[PDB]
């Protein structure tokens, strides 16, 4: 094969660069086929759901209620794993903040996630969550949860 | 960061079903010196096809890049992040891969002018003229061997 170095590399500027989905860690790694991000989010009270946003189509309310059934109400974090896809949550002073991400997601940005719809549903909605009906908060906060999925999903 | 959070594995009797992804996750340590990544024929800003050997938002990149190159003949290639982008624009037609920073040039050329070849024999003076993705369903499988073979 012949020969190159008459030909120059050139630097040039992108708005958007070039992301090769890889791992969060070392740089040597591809994935062959798409990494998805976080798929779904709800905030819930105990079994009691309050808002919630999908990204695509799922089983997610299926699944979200089989979820809720297991955790426990005292505070803490924790993930879950089940086939190709992971659950993360929060449960905080009764309220359980979760998400459900390819099993590809890096756990921490899930967390950060997690977190920041906490902070906004709680500077939102206050102490109303501890007693509010069933989807009380949905159409309000859904779009808060779309907005969020997103940002956190890209960066 | 999240290393002190427990991760457990669960049973359910109705598992989760999300349509519309891939079958599998597949992970290669990358062959910096050998890994073409992506390969594209175009005409000035239109696609007439492309592969892509792994994820990636390469059309993206490809659009961005394809407005950048000036119309008469010559080779180069861009350096942008980790990546080169090698190219050869010939009687208007450009011929384009994508590679880690650290790939022998050479190699990206041999393929280049490989795929340049195939293609004008196949398609002829059609090119000049053909519609965007036109050439794609039938030469992207040609892109994808000899990505395959140049990559080995
Ligand atoms: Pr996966
Ligand atoms: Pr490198």
Redesign the interface.
């Given at each position: 094969?012949?020969?190159?170095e008459h030909?120059?590399?050139?630097?040039?500027?992108?708005?958007?660069?070039?992301?090769?989905?890889?791992?969060p860690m070392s740089?040597?790694?591809?994935?062959?086929?798409?990494?998805?991000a976080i798929?779904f989010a709800v905030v819930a009270r105990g079994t009691t759901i309050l808002a919630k946003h999908a990204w695509?189509?799922?089983?997610?309310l299926?699944?979200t209620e089989?979820?809720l059934a297991?955790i426990p109400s005292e505070n803490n974090?924790?993930?879950?794993?089940?086939?190709?896809?992971?659950?993360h949550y929060i449960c905080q002073d009764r309220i359980v903040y979760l998400c459900?991400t390819?099993?590809?997601f890096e756990?921490?940005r899930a967390?950060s996630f997690l977190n920041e719809v906490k902070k906004r549903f709680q500077t939102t909605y206050g102490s109303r969550a501890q007693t509010a009906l069933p989807y009380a908060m949905n159409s309000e906060f859904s779009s808060v949860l779309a907005a969020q999925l997103k940002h956190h999903s890209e960066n």
């Open positions: 094969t012949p020969g190159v030909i120059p590399v050139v630097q040039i500027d992108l708005s958007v660069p070039l992301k090769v989905p890889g791992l740089d040597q790694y591809v994935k062959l086929e798409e990494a998805m798929l695509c189509g799922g089983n997610f299926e699944v089989q979820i297991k974090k924790l993930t879950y794993s089940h086939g190709n896809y992971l659950f459900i390819d099993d590809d756990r921490s967390f």
